[PDB]
């Protein structure tokens, strides 16, 4: 076996060369398709063009910042130490410049859009205060992350909500969610049968969640999803100057749940902080999770809202965690082990996807059994209270009532306008004591109730509201918190840290509350630039 | 932040007197609501006023008799003593009153309603002499738990099957059952949707037990159940004279199931001894679960039976027990110690109906697949059958013609007919060599049929039998004792003691005979009390 | 209790001749049964007198071969000294024969059925040459185990395929699956109701592999299967040379899958060497498992070519992965140790039912979820296809064009014709990039096709292919090789041998191709054999 041998030592001479080489290969023809391809016909060639272009940019991108790093940082530095020379008195000038600008579009647009507007603006005056006179070390409060983070929601609502560019852009994101979540169906039709629309939500739209869940498998096998991770992280920590572990799982709970997104940090998880370990959790309940994103959008809840309120929630989670919870400690782990995300142990990527589809499994049982056991205690609690209310010759008491009283204040504060804020109070009610599958599958119902077009009132009850409203539900709704949820969130924590039960146990419920006002507080910028049909 | 060190050494300096004043005025506001309630009208009021009534009653006895425990101990001390004195001679004149007191209710009662009824206290007392005979120790036979305990279902069933009070308290427990398992229906249905009901048993009665399962979760962390199980488990220990940890998993058995029920003693079952270890496996296997209870309720078998039957299954079991594997050994587990059970963790009633609701996941999960198994296997055992008949000319060869013929002694015995006996057999075996749920299914059947009213014989083969028969027949299938759970209760138990694997692999199949021998108790007590129609 | 006593010393006294005399009388209970049907009518009778006499001759000869070894050894020594003494001009003579007889067979029978025959003759030329070119050690091979291996398949097809007595067993054997698979349906129609075939593939379907399941495991615990699995490890041992641990595993192959073939020698698994280990793997990956058999019959797949198909793929597997892995070390395990199997711990045959039940709720979850992924994928993987062709006026584009290009030359060399090998290809892709359920979902698609009759192009499509090209398909597809199963096998395997992660992990690939390789190697041993209808 001579040959055998020859053939052996060519590839480990040059396998360097080989190997690269074959990638070459590819790549021409990849860029010969493409070329030949808009030859062919530019105008139904374009978004092959625009996509190859892009990723050669980042590609590039990405190659020059790792090598020139050291000669780039040098040549930043002059500028650095001039600005830290003249910034004891250039900070009164640029701060009087963005307060002068705040005040000026509330007086000539927000004060021109209506009342409600502003109030959504009191609203988060209010809802931060609340955060501060209520924190845990009010004197230790470091301001910066806080301003910031509430000015990068401001900037992403103005960008998309305010802006064509931002508008288009996540509108035609948002049907490409729809038309992805329409590939489960061949995979349904053939285990369910023809019939399975005769059970929509078990036989077609928990498909939605198998699929979704294999895909997001696959990207972090690719090393996709880790790509656009590092890249938001990085905004957020060199602006708000969060420290770069709370800054990863931020970033990365916008596509990940609460209960993995720490993964992305595992090993690194004992020598966290108290504020840290506070940070983490609060992200995980101020966000949702990609796999679930489309079982929403199926109800029929705006798949672009869904998409812009999860990216504001990173910068809001952030800025409530350092209110509620301030850093008094020193951090230990640095930028480079907190962006290392160590990938899992898949071989290639059919393997990826099998993996997803079977962690899949648990999620989608405890997704129908916390449903049917939710709504039938809330069939049973309704019963109860109605047997109560008849004593007094109220038989219309429910749970309904009371929530649409007890919680009517926090949907006011976020702008909905008075009669609309008992309706939004009730769906805050079933999100904090069962969880968003039923709140949005109530506000869905809402939804359709306008579109057909029928009476707003029947009998002196209302029937549907605005679309303003609609939105700002959307945004206080999107997110993981409720009371149930508490116990899931310590255990699968404690497991990846058991050294650190104690201090996870103790910064759990403050969690929890700042995740709610971390949504809240996207639903008033929202709502102050939402005008009133 | 004085303001806020100010508040906090009010609340430390006054935190007893701070919460307790709370719950004092949540107090008043609900027995506001109650006299207001009255006032507006007192018949409409009447079951929230009992409600609050009989509630305040315990808590006022559990209040004193935990203040007040070592004065009322000593006070009954010097009648204590006294009848130990004159215990030697009065002995014979109390166990003289009872048996003449026993032939007279022969003579009046039992010999009045007939032959069949006489034949069931036959039944019990040769049930009785053929657990002595095959007993482990028949020489160690501590005889008082063997009376105390049949004697208490002889009273249960007096009080609930011959008294107008027991019966219309029995049957209005019943029919709460029955109202309770319909809430299910709203969380079914929108997971299945509208069409639920195309799938009866997976879509509809499997709901049932995960609604169930998330209410009994509820009541343990309320504590609720165990403050039941306490009171029942002093009544059975101070007359029948039983050990603190097979008095509590007895009463803890009525509601809970088998593999579950250890758990309310789980750190003291490494030093319990080899007869209280039979105890916990024979209570388990003459009893089933709540969380079961409903499916049987959905299928036709009445409610008011299962629950007489539950209750009166916890003194047979022990009476069963006692007789069969007697206590040859010292005790170690004091009272004290058994009656605190160690409450789960969950932190509020939201978290503890989420954790009832995932672990209901696999118990219908193998509900639903040991049912698909167990009826092809009996599709097939019965082809195979007629195929050997047909070598005969005997063709109708069945698993229910033999074990209408192998089983037929013991129905008689319990007091059924002669022609009935040969279907309450059928029963029996589907019960022994499958399990509950196969027999429920089966008698449920009858009853339809029964009901309908159709003809009793069609072509000489008997369609229905009496009333009094599928009465007798719900208490004899009222256990979860079948040769295939041998080994879920083996491995359960050793897990939760891994030091005794070699006791209770030796206790376990007496356990299982002893428990169908408890069953079969309850149905000659039924039986010898219930009239014909 | 001295009666208790005596009875007690009866037993223990004379416990042999108690047991023994009770099985004798049950032994003859049976055969009265049996001769007395065979008098009342033989004919009728006839299946149960041959089954009766077979088990007799087993017992017998089991027995004989058990206390009769070391003598019918010593009598077989004279002839097997003077062949070894003869042998070395003896081997030129046999071999010899052999070769010619090949030629015969070729020129007389296989040139006579046509090119196509031919051509898969040449195919087994191929993959076994290319096997060996690529092997890990080309100068170490043991041909014995190749020659036999092939030797054995022919010797099988022969039998099978062109013998009436083997056509009629297992055509006969395959018409015994389908009416065993209908048994399931008594459960499905109570669990899922009379509308259970409104979802076909998930409520009728699953259900044959829940009840298949159950059965496998009652044939374990009774020894059954156990008993065939020796007998067929020691005719491949004892022609092949193979390893008495590579030998057990391949034949448990057949009936078992292969996450659970291993644990027929589980304690010997830390000592197995390199090539022990690949042949392990290739055995599993080469064959499928009796659990998910009735579901392959149930879309339309023929039962006979499946079963004949398994048992071809024992001898194949040992051949291609003795030949890509020879062994260089000395094997440890013997074959006393190989051959016990350690059952289960299951107390009784209802216990094994329930095992078997609970251990298919994993089985049917994870094969429902990725064909609802990999389906969903392939949706989308053709539109992304479709919308890249359209740019150069080509959105035919598919994932099967791609595949009936690619895999063609595989199915043209075992012998498919050349319009049909492009359909082929086909399916090899359905079976390498997701798995043989989705291929063999589609085969049985253009099966009903060519039943009904329709035309067999339309507009230049090609509808449906030949039977020949049927059962050559059914032969090629029948394992469980494919690039996502790689990590369940590396996982389980390392689980029951910490120890070796690193030699598991290096063999995995090699054996996925070997696995591959050999159940194209039945397929052109089949293709040889049957004639162009
Ligand atoms: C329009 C919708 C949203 C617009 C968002 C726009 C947000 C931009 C708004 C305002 C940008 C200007 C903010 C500058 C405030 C100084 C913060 C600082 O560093 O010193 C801190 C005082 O921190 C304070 O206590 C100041 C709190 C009151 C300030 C209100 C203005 C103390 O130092 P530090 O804690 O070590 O830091
Ligand atoms: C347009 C419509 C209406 C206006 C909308 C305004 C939207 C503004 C949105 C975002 C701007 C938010 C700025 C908040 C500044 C916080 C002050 C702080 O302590 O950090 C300072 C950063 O140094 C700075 O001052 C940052 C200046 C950035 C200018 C952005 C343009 C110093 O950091 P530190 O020394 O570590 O402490
Ligand atoms: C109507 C339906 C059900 C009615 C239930 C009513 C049940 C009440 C029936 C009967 C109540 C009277 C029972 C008193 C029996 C004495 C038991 C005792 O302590 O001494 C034991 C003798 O134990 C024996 O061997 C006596 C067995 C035969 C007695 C039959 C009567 C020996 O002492 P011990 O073992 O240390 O105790
Ligand atoms: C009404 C219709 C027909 C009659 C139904 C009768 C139903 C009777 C139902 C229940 C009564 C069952 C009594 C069984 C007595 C067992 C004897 C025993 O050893 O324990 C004795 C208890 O001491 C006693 O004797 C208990 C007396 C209780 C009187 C109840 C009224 C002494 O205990 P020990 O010293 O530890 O031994
Ligand atoms: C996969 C594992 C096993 C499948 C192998 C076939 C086993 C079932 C065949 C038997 C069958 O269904 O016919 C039945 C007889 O069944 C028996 O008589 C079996 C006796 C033991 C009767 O069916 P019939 O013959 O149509 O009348
Ligand atoms: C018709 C369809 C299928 C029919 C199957 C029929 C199969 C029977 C076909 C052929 C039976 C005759 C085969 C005998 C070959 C000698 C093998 C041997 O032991 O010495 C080996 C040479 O091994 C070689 O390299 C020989 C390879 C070429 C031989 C082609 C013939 C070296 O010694 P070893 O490695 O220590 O062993
Ligand atoms: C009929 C239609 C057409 C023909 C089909 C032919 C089908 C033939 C099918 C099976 C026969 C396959 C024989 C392969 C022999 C391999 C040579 C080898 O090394 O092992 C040798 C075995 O010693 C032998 O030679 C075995 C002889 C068996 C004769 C079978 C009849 C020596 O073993 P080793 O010393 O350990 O080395
Ligand atoms: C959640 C994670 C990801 C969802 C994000 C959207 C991804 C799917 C959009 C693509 C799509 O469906 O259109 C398809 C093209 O799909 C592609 O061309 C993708 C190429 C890679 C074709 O659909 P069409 O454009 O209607 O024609
Ligand atoms: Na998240
Ligand atoms: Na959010
Ligand atoms: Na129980
Ligand atoms: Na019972
Ligand atoms: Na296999
Ligand atoms: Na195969």
Redesign the pocket.
Known sequence: ERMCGRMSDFCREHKTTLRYIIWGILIAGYLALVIAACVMNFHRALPLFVITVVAIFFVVWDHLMAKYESQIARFLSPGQRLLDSHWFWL?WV??GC?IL??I??LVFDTAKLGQQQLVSFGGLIIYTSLTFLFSKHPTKVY??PV??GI??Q??LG?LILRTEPGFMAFDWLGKQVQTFLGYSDAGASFVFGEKYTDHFFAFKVLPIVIFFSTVMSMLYYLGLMQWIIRKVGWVMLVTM?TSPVESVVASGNIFIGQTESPLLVRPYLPYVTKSELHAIMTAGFSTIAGSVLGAYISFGVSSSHLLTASVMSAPAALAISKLFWPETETPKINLKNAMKMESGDSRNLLEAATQGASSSISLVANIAVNLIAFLALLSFMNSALSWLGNMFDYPQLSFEVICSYVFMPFAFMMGVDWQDSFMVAKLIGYKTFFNEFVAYQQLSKLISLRQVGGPKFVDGVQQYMSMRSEAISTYALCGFANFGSLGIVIGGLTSMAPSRKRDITAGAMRALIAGTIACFLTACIAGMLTNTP
């Open positions: 900070k640029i701060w963005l600008g705040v000026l579009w301001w910066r301003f910031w000015g990068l401001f900037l103005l100057g």
